[PDB]
Each structure stands twice: as C-alpha cells, then as structure tokens.
Amino acid sequence: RPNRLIVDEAINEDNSVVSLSQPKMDELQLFRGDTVLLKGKKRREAVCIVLSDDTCSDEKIRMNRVVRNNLRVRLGDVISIQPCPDVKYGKRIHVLPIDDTVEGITGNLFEVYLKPYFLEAYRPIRKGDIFLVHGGMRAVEFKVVETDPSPYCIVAPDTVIHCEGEPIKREDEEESLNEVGYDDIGGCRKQLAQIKEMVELPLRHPALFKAIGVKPPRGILLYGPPGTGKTLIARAVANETGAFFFLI
Amino acid sequence: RPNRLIVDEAINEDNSVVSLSQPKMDELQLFRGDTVLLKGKKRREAVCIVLSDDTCSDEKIRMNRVVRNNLRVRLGDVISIQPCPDVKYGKRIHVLPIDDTVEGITGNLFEVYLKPYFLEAYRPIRKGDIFLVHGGMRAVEFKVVETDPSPYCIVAPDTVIHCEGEPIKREDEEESLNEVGYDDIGGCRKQLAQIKEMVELPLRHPALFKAIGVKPPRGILLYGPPGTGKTLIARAVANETGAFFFLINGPEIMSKLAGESESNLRKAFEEAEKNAPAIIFIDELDAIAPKREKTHGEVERRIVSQLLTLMDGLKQRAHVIVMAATNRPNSIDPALRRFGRFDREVDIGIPDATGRLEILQIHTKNMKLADDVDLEQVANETHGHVGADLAALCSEAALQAIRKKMDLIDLEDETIDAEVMNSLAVTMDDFRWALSQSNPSALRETVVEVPQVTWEDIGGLEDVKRELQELVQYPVEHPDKFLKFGMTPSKGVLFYGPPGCGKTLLAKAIANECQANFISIKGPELLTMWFGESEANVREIFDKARQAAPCVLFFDELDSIAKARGGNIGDGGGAADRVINQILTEMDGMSTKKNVFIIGATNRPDIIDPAILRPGRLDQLIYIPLPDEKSRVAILKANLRKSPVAKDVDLEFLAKMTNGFSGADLTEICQRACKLAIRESIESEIRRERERQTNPSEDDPVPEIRRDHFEEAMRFARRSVSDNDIRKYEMFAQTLQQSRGFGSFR
Numbered sequence: 001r002p003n004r005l006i007v008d009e010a011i012n013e014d015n016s017v018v019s020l021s022q023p024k025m026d027e028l029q030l031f032r033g034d035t036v037l038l039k040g041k042k043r044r045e046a047v048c049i050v051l052s053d054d055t056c057s058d059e060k061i062r063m064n065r066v067v068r069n070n071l072r073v074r075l076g077d078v079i080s081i082q083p084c085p086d087v088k089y090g091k092r093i094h095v096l097p098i099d100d101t102v103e104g105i106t107g108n109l110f111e112v113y114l115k116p117y118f119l120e121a122y123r124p125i126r127k128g129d130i131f132l133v134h135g136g137m138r139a140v141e142f143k144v145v146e147t148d149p150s151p152y153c154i155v156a157p158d159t160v161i162h163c164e165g166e167p168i169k170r171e172d173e174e175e176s177l178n179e180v181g182y183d184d185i186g187g188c189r190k191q192l193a194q195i196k197e198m199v200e201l202p203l204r205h206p207a208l209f210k211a212i213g214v215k216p217p218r219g220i221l222l223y224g225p226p227g228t229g230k231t232l233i234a235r236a237v238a239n240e241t242g243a244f245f246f247l248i
Numbered sequence: 249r250p251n252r253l254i255v256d257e258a259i260n261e262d263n264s265v266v267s268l269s270q271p272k273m274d275e276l277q278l279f280r281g282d283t284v285l286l287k288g289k290k291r292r293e294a295v296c297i298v299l300s301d302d303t304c305s306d307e308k309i310r311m312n313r314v315v316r317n318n319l320r321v322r323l324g325d326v327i328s329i330q331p332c333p334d335v336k337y338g339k340r341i342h343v344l345p346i347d348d349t350v351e352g353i354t355g356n357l358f359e360v361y362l363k364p365y366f367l368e369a370y371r372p373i374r375k376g377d378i379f380l381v382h383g384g385m386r387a388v389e390f391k392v393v394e395t396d397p398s399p400y401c402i403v404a405p406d407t408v409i410h411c412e413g414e415p416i417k418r419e420d421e422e423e424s425l426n427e428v429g430y431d432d433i434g435g436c437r438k439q440l441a442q443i444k445e446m447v448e449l450p451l452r453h454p455a456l457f458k459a460i461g462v463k464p465p466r467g468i469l470l471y472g473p474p475g476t477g478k479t480l481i482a483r484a485v486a487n488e489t490g491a492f493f494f495l496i497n498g499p500e501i502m503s504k505l506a507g508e509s510e511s512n513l514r515k516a517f518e519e520a521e522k523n524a525p526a527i528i529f530i531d532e533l534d535a536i537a538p539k540r541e542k543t544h545g546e547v548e549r550r551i552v553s554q555l556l557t558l559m560d561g562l563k564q565r566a567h568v569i570v571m572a573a574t575n576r577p578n579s580i581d582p583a584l585r586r587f588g589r590f591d592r593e594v595d596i597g598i599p600d601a602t603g604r605l606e607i608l609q610i611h612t613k614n615m616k617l618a619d620d621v622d623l624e625q626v627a628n629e630t631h632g633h634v635g636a637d638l639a640a641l642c643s644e645a646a647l648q649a650i651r652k653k654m655d656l657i658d659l660e661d662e663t664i665d666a667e668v669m670n671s672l673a674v675t676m677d678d679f680r681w682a683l684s685q686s687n688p689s690a691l692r693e694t695v696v697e698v699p700q701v702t703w704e705d706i707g708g709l710e711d712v713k714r715e716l717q718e719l720v721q722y723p724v725e726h727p728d729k730f731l732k733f734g735m736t737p738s739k740g741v742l743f744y745g746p747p748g749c750g751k752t753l754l755a756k757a758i759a760n761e762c763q764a765n766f767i768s769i770k771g772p773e774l775l776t777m778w779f780g781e782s783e784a785n786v787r788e789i790f791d792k793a794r795q796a797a798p799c800v801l802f803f804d805e806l807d808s809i810a811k812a813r814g815g816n817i818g819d820g821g822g823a824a825d826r827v828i829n830q831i832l833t834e835m836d837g838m839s840t841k842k843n844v845f846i847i848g849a850t851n852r853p854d855i856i857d858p859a860i861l862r863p864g865r866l867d868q869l870i871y872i873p874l875p876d877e878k879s880r881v882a883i884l885k886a887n888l889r890k891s892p893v894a895k896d897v898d899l900e901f902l903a904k905m906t907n908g909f910s911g912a913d914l915t916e917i918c919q920r921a922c923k924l925a926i927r928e929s930i931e932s933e934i935r936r937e938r939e940r941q942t943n944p945s946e947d948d949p950v951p952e953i954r955r956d957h958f959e960e961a962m963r964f965a966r967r968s969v970s971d972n973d974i975r976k977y978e979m980f981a982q983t984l985q986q987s988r989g990f991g992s993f994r
C-alpha cells in the first residue's frame with residue numbers, strides 16, 4: 001500500500017527532495033521527477049519532488065528537516081502520500097521572510113538569497129509552506145503565503161513569483177521547531193544512529209512503555225573530548241523527536 | 249502423618265505444580281498427577297497438582313510463589329494437605345485480571361495471555377484463587393472469582409471458562425505480597441541459601457529469640473559488584489519471609505541537611521523497630537560509611553558515628569536486622585566490620601556460567617522468546633556480565649524486537665496494546681546484537697565459579713587423577729580416619745611439568761568433582777601485583793577465597809614472578825620476591841581453613857623458592873609428565889570430542905606419530921585441523937553460493953573434520969618442549985625423590 005510510509009532522514013536534501021526507491025516508486029506511480037503531493041499530519045500537504053538513493057530499502061521515505069518541519073512531522077513518524085504526476089502553473093506566488101530568520105539583515109531578499117532557489121530547485125511551493133534557502137551566512141527561511149494553484153504547482157520561470165515586503169513573525173503557536181536537528185550533525189553518524197535507536201521509542205512512544213514492561217535506558221552518558229557535539233547531538237535528538245529539552 | 253508438611257522452594261513451578269516424593273506420595277495417597285487439594289493457613293485451599301523431583305528428601309513440600317501467595321503462606325511455614333484423588337468438572341469458571349498487573353495493557357486477555365494456560369497446565373482453579381500466567385512482556389496475573397466445583401476441579405477443555413470484563417483492584421487488605429521473591433533470583437542459589445539459613449529464624453520466629461538466648465546476626469553485610477542483585481536478594485528474603493523491608497539507600501540520606509540526615513537515619517531505625525519483624529537495608533553503604541581516615545569531615549563521619557551508635561545500639565530483642573550492600577567491603581569503615589554490628593558478610597559475586605542461564609530464564613519469562621533461541625549459548629558468551637548486565641541484555645533484545653516490528657506496530661496511533669505484543673518473538677538474531685552491544689560491568693574481578701570440566705575431559709594422566717583425587721576427596725569423605733592416624737591433611741599441591749600439560753585442567757576438574765569454587769590467579773595477575781608495587785592486593789585474593797565455599801585457590805602459572813626476573817640465577821636478587829613472599833605469608837593463615845586446598849602450577853619449578861614447598865604450605869609436589877602413547881590417544885579423543893569427526897581418522901596412528909607433543913600443542917594440532925576443515929567448508933559454501941547465483945541455480949560438501957585436514961594440520965604442527973626441558977623436570981624431581989630400594993628390610 002503506497003498511501004502510507006514511515007519517514008526517515010534524508011542525505012540529498014536540496015531543501016525540497018523527497019527520496020523513494022524506483023522498485024517502490026513504480027508502486028507510487030512516479031518515475032523520474034513527478035510531483036509527490038506529500039500529505040502531512042494535521043492540515044497541510046507539500047508538493048515535493050521524487051528521487052532515489054541507496055538507503056531507501058523499499059521500506060522508508062526520506063525527508064530533510066525543511067519538509068519535516070513544514071509538514072509538522074518529527075523524524076520517525078508515519079505519514080501519507082497522494083501521488084499525482086501532473087503539471088500546473090501558478091501566477092500569484094507571494095512570499096515573505098520569517099522574522100526569526102531575518103532580524104537584522106535587510107536588502108533585496110527577492111534577489112540576494114532567492115534567485116538560485118525559485119527555479120530549477122523545485123521548492124515545495126504551496127500556500128502556508130515554509131522553506132529554508134540558506135543564503136548569505138545565515139539560514140534565512142521564508143514562507144510562501146499565497147499559491148493560487150494547490151496543493152501542487154510548477155516551480156519554473158513560467159510561474160510568476162512576486163516581491164516580498166516587511167518581515168513577518170514566526171508562528172509561536174507551533175514555534176516551527178527550527179533549532180537544530182540531525183541534518184546539521186556530521187562526523188558521528190554511527191553514534192547518532194546508536195542514540196536514535198536507543199532513545200527514539202521511549203520519547204516518541206511513551207504509551208507502550210507503560211504496557212510493554214521492559215525498562216528503557218533511564219539515562220544515557222554521552223561523552224567525548226570537549227566541543228565534540230555532545231550538547232548538539234543531545235539537542236538534535238531532543239528536538240528531532242519532539243521531546244522537551246531541559247539543559248541543566 | 250501426611251496431613252501436615254513444611255513448605256519449601258520449588259524449581260519446576262509451571263504456576264501450578266506442587267512437588268512431593270513418591271516414597272512420600274504413597275503415604276499421601278497420590279501416584280501420578282492426582283489432585284492435592286492443598287490446605288492453606290486462614291480460610292482458603294487450592295487444588296494444585298502433585299509431582300516429584302530430587303530435592304524433596306521425603307521431608308518437605310515445594311510450592312512456587314504463585315501458590316504460596318495464593319494460600320497466604322510464606323516460604324518456611326507449615327501447612328496442611330487434604331489429599332483427594334477425584335475428578336469433578338465445572339461449568340461457570342469466571343476470571344478477572346488484577347489491576348495491579350493490568351494497568352495499561354488492553355486487549356482480548358481471554359485469548360492473548362490465557363489460551364496456553366487454561367488447559368494442560370492445570371491452574372489451581374478455585375473460587376478466590378489468584379494465579380500468574382506470564383503473558384506478553386509482563387507478569388500479568390488473574391483471579392478466578394467463581395468456581396462452581398470446589399475446592400478441586402478438572403482443568404480441561406470439558407470445563408467451561410468464560411470471558412472476563414473490566415480489571416479489578418488488588419486486595420489492599422492483604423496486598424497479595426507480589427513484589428519479588430526467591431523464584432526470580434538466579435545465579436546465586438548458594439548465597440541465597442546461606443542468607444536464608446542465616447536470617448529465616450530471627451524474622452519468622454522472633455518469639456523464640458527472646459527465649460533462646462543466643463544472639464542471631466544483628467546485621468548482614470551483603471556485597472558484590474554493582475548490579476549483582478544485593479538489593480534484589482535483600483528484598484526477596486524480606487518479602488518471602490513476610491518481614492517489612494525498609495530501604496534507606498545511602499544517597500537518599502546523605503543528600504539531606506547535616507544533622508537532619510542523622511535524624512532521618514535515626515527515625516528510619518525507629519520505624520524498623522516499631523514493628524518487630526522488619527528489616528532495614530542500607531544500600532550503597534560505601535557512601536554512608538567509607539574508610540574513616542579517608543573521610544573529609546562533618547556528614548561523612550557524623551553519619552558513621554550516628555550509624556554506629558544505632559548499628560549496635562539495637563538490643564537485638566526488637567527483632568530488627570540491618571542488612572547492608574557494599575562493594576568489596578575493604579572500602580567501608582573498618583569500625584563497621586566489628587562483631588555485634590556486621591558479623592556475617594556473605595559474598596554474592598558475579599553469576600557463573602550456568603547461573604547466567606537461570607538469570608536469563610527468569611528475566612526472559614515474559615518476552616515470549618522464540619523457539620530457535622536457546623539462552624545457553626547467550627549465557628556462555630556473556631562472560632563477566634553481572635545480573636544487571638543480563639537484565640540490560642534482556643531489555644535490549646526486547647527493544648530491538650519492538651524496533652524491528654515498529655513498521656507493523658505503529659499502524660494505528662502508535663501502540664494500541666492488543667494481541668500484537670505476542671508476535672515479537674525475540675529470536676537469537678536479536679540476542680546476538682544485544683550481547684555484542686553490551687559492555688560487561690565486572691570483567692576485571694576474580695570470578696568464583698564451579699568449573700564444568702569433568703574428569704572425562706582430562707584424558708591420559710591417570711596416576712595423577714588418583715593421586716590428586718586422594719588428597720582432595722579422602723579428607724572430606726572420611727575425615728574420621730585422618731584424625732585417628734594423626735596426620736593432618738595436606739592443604740597444598742603444586743603441579744610441575746612441561747608447559748601446557750593440563751595443570752589448569754586438572755585443578756578445574758578437582759574443583760568440579762567436589763562441587764568447589766575455583767579461583768585462578770594466573771601468572772599475569774601476579775606480575776601485575778609485582779610490577780605495580782601492590783603486593784598487599786594479594787591479601788584480598790586470599791580473602792576472596794576465604795569468604796567462599798570449599799575453594800581450590802589455584803595459582804596458575806606460578807613462578808611467573810621469578811621467571812620475569814631471570815630467576816634464582818642471572819639476577820642480583822634471590823629467589824624470594826614481593827608477590828611470592830606475600831603469597832607465602834598469607835597462605836600460612838589459610839593452613840587452618842580446612843576448606844581451601846591451595847593449588848600451584850609451574851612450568852619451570854627449579855626457580856621456585858623452596859620456602860613454599862615445605863609442610864603446611866604447598867608441600868606435596870606432583871609431577872604430570874608429557875603424555876604417553878595411550879595418554880595422547882585419550883587426549884586426542886577428549887579434545888576432539890564435542891566436534892564432528894569422520895570415521896576415516898584413526899587417532900592411534902596420529903598419537904604415535906605425535907611422538908613428543910604436550911597437551912597444549914596437541915590441542916593446537918586439533919584446532920589447526922578444525923580451522924582448515926572450517927576453511928574448506930566455508931570455501932565450498934561460497935562456491936555453492938556462486939553456483940546458486942549463476943545460471944544453473946549435495947548440501948554437505950564437508951559435514952565433519954575430514955582426515956586430510958588432520959594430515960595438513962599435523963604437517964603444520966609445532967612442539968614447544970625440547971629434550972633438555974623435559975629432562976629438567978625429572979632432574980628437579982630427583983631433588984625430593986630417592987631410589988633407596990636397598991632398605992628392603994621392612
């Protein structure tokens with residue numbers, strides 16, 4: 001059943017790509033780069049782009065933190081897909097930057113950190129979508145407010161993208177959970193995978209641990225030379241799983 | 249009189265079985281499986297099933313904690329029996345789960361954790377009965393409310409069992425005393441038995457101890473590596489005997505305000521005293537009372553004195569017992585080691601090879617382990633793992649099984665409990681991972697164990713199997729004769745011979761025969777002490793042997809200290825040295841311990857200082873020669889045993905061709921043969937995989953170690969002893985030997 005799949009960490013990213021397996025994409029009815037129309041959890045969907053790599057195993061779907069945070073999905077969750085290989089263009093795409101990411105940088109953000117991403121990168125353009133572009137020495141992110149096609153659109157120069165205005169505040173009702181995550185952890189992939197397999201279930205699934213009975217690790221003693229990322233990996237495995245992180 | 253009997257621990261369990269002895273069941277009027285109609289203490293009876301095993305002794309009746317708690321009986325009590333070999337069936341058996349055991353698991357409990365127990369298991373079905381079934385990863389228990397036959401019924405599909413409803417609350421009026429007990433303690437059966445015989449009477453029978461006069465142990469100092477079960481065994485011997493258990497774990501008190509923590513400890517002792525049978529358990533006593541002179545000040549000593557004045561302040565007529573947990577109590581305050589406060593200091597120690605099997609069995613009760621898993625390979629491979637490590641491995645395997653099934657477990661909104669939990673089936677493939685991903689807690693501690701190398705394994709040497717069986721088994725089996733002729737049994741034996749000739753194997757076999765612990769301090773450990781300028785550590789090792797049961801403290805590869813510095817010649821110093829001298833000094837203390845049988849092993853005896861090989865110390869020299877023809881045949885057969893071998897090989901020819909090879913290098917020849925055989929087998933296996941992958945798309949190219957493999961291994965053999973080296977041992981033997989056959993005149 002290609003409708004539902006369990007999410008996983010992506011490696012290609014591109015701020016937009018969702019990776020499947022061709023032996024599985026055939027069941028998903030996507031071949032080369034067709035639109036995915038990713039279905040989220042609460043009340044949103046993303047167009048996304050289909051691609052493949054080695055780590056699929058025909059079992060899991062991979063999405064970078066841009067999509068995961070856009071769809072309100074934490075790594076390790078289960079989501080749905082609504083494949084639709086169709087092309088439809090928009091004309092009133094309007095975008096505004098996020099104050100949490102623009103709070104002292106001022107300029108032609110339509111040109112300075114936007115040109116190399118609004119075409120040929122296939123941004124998950126859809127009303128309410130939030131995407132990071134990684135511009136000039138800061139992870140500047142934007143939100144596309146209006147997209148007159150939906151939930152999918154062609155990201156191409158034929159589609160019209162309009163200039164932005166003053167920055168808007170981030171949604172504190174959800175906080176967007178930007179912080180950090182697995183995508184900005186490098187050099188300890190094996191250790192991060194060990195911590196993930198060690199801590200994901202008790203944090204994501206506290207319900208079963210009151211019934212399953214077996215005790216999970218009450219505490220995990222990360223250690224290493226100073227500045228190795230212990231705090232970084234702890235905060236990543238906290239935010240990435242949605243667990244509240246209390247630094248003492 | 250078969251009516252009344254004293255209860256005891258059961259080993260077969262089955263949640264229902266009550267074990268008697270057939271020579272006693274004949275008096276009980278039960279033969280094969282007849283109903284027992286067990287009679288309890290207050291107002292209840294159980295049907296139970298009769299069976300037998302070894303430990304009955306025609307004196308005691310054995311019941312698992314399910315029956316004991318069902319009948320309101322504590323282990324060590326006296327109960328009655330009302331035999332009635334009759335069959336009567338019921339039709340309105342209704343059961344409900346206990347909320348204390350079901351508080352978050354929801355599903356078809358009539359099917360998920362009930363089917364494999366309501367028939368052919370013979371549950372103690374009777375109105376008011378409570379039974380544990382051990383279902384899906386939790387010790388779920390149920391209570392049968394109504395049983396229209398009573399007090400006995402047939403547990404068979406003819407009898408009708410009905411579906412349950414919402415869970416019911418546990419009876420707080422009695423609390424059911426589930427907690428833990430002896431049945432979930434494994435790997436320290438001897439130590440648990442010692443604690444039971446030490447503590448059962450004062451707790452169960454406080455009445456006599458106000459009249460008996462003799463003081464029981466006011467405090468018991470349990471100790472061992474962390475996670476060994478000290479708290480678990482303390483809580484088991486508390487609950488199992490009905491004694492109130494008060495845990496005052498060190499940090500919980502040391503964390504409170506100075507002076508106020510003293511009051512907290514004092515009022516904890518007052519709480520223990522206000523009720524007579526209570527026992528107070530001091531966990532992590534190292535923190536509370538470390539070495540006095542090593543404490544800094546204020547609390548670290550304010551508590552200790554406050555502890556001491558309370559440790560011995562109790563009059564022992566209040567029936568309060570102060571158990572304690574520590575790690576190698578050489579670290580705790582010596583003042584607490586005095587008598588009247590801590591007079592008994594049993595050593596739990598890490599579980600041995602066959603104890604980890606029992607620990608896994610008890611911990612892997614609810615996991616619903618698959619059939620392909622054995623739990624004996626896991627126990628053997630988990631060398632050095634403490635019981636806590638075994639529990640961690642258990643939990644890791646369970647978590648991996650969940651995590652390899654999260655794909656089909658999170659179908660609904662995460663977990664819905666449900667029957668799905670039975671599907672886990674933790675196969676070996678998950679244990680392997682957990683074992684490989686767990687670090688032994690105590691891998692650098694001298695392990696006390698009963699080795700499982702029997703006399704059969706050590707073939708060949710025979711005069712030494714009877715010249716060594718004598719010294720060990722005669723002064724224990726018939727000590728009366730030895731105290732008649734006046735000789736004191738020789739508590740010392742050193743084996744001198746060619747290197748690698750079974751000295752360790754012979755010592756381990758001696759330990760195995762008389763069910764004795766075997767502490768081997770190999771040569772490298774003695775070198776660690778000698779180089780480290782820490783010969784005082786030797787005092788610990790001997791003590792480690794003293795606190796144990798009959799123990800062949802075995803100084804494997806003795807003289808390594810002297811071998812590491814040339815020896816009696818070639819070095820400025822003499823034969824004596826730090827570690828050997830300390831061993832000599834401490835050995836004289838254990839010359840009157842009458843349970844320890846200090847053994848030595850030396851690959852080069854002539855360098856050993858003769859101060860140790862004189863009466864009292866390792867006086868009795870024993871020579872194990874390099875194996876002879878028949879002995880080499882026996883060694884070959886014994887060390888190729890437990891491994892496939894073809895009929896083509898004839899070990900007699902190999903043995904005779906094996907002209908001058910010791911035991912170690914002969915087993916090396918066998919290992920090389922097996923290594924080449926496994927290489928051939930794996931090469932053939934990968935070639936067969938090649939054939940499978942290619943177009944063509946007989947399964948046993950080499951199902952045993954073949955003969956030409958032995959040929960090639962022997963061609964690859966190597967000998968470690970030369971003519972001069974082997975002659976040196978006999979020349980040394982001449983020092984304490986003679987050929988004075990001239991004095992034939994009686």
Ligand SMILES: C[C@@H]1CN(C(=O)Cn2ncc(-c3cc(F)c(OCc4nnc(SC5CCCCC5)n4-c4cccnc4)cc3F)n2)C[C@H](C)O1
Nearest residue numbers: 719720723727730731734736737762764798799842843845
């Ligand atoms: C003043 C003295 C004495 N004297 C006497 O007239 C009185 N007298 N005569 C004999 C004994 C005697 C002493 C013992 F120490 C003893 O110990 C038995 C024992 N129990 N368990 C084990 S462990 C064994 C080995 C390892 C674990 C697995 C099983 N052993 C054991 C085994 C092997 C060797 N040694 C002890 C038994 C005895 F009979 N006292 C006069 C004399 C001139 O000098």
Ligand SMILES: Nc1ncnc2c1ncn2[C@@H]1O[C@H](COP(=O)(O)OP(=O)(O)O)[C@@H](O)[C@H]1O
Nearest residue numbers: 184185186187188226227228229230231232233
């Ligand atoms: N494995 C890593 N991946 C990415 N950044 C790292 C890593 N380890 C350290 N850093 C960087 O070093 C800084 C300190 O991180 P961390 O070691 O987690 O905190 P601390 O240095 O206080 O232990 C961070 O700003 C982080 O960007």
Ligand SMILES: Nc1ncnc2c1ncn2[C@@H]1O[C@H](COP(=O)(O)OP(=O)(O)O)[C@@H](O)[C@H]1O
Nearest residue numbers: 432433434474475476477478479480635636639
């Ligand atoms: N001999 C044993 N038998 C069964 N379980 C044990 C044993 N030793 C340790 N454990 C397990 O290890 C854990 C810790 O037990 P224990 O050592 O009594 O407490 P602590 O580790 O605080 O000293 C328990 O959950 C228990 O299940």
Ligand SMILES: Nc1ncnc2c1ncn2[C@@H]1O[C@H](COP(=O)(O)OP(=O)(O)O)[C@@H](O)[C@H]1O
Nearest residue numbers: 706707747748749750751752753883911912915
């Ligand atoms: N019947 C036997 N006789 C002698 N050695 C054997 C016998 N069976 C096996 N062995 C091998 O002998 C070795 C024991 O060597 P050991 O004599 O303890 O060395 P050392 O003499 O240095 O203490 C083991 O590795 C074992 O494989």
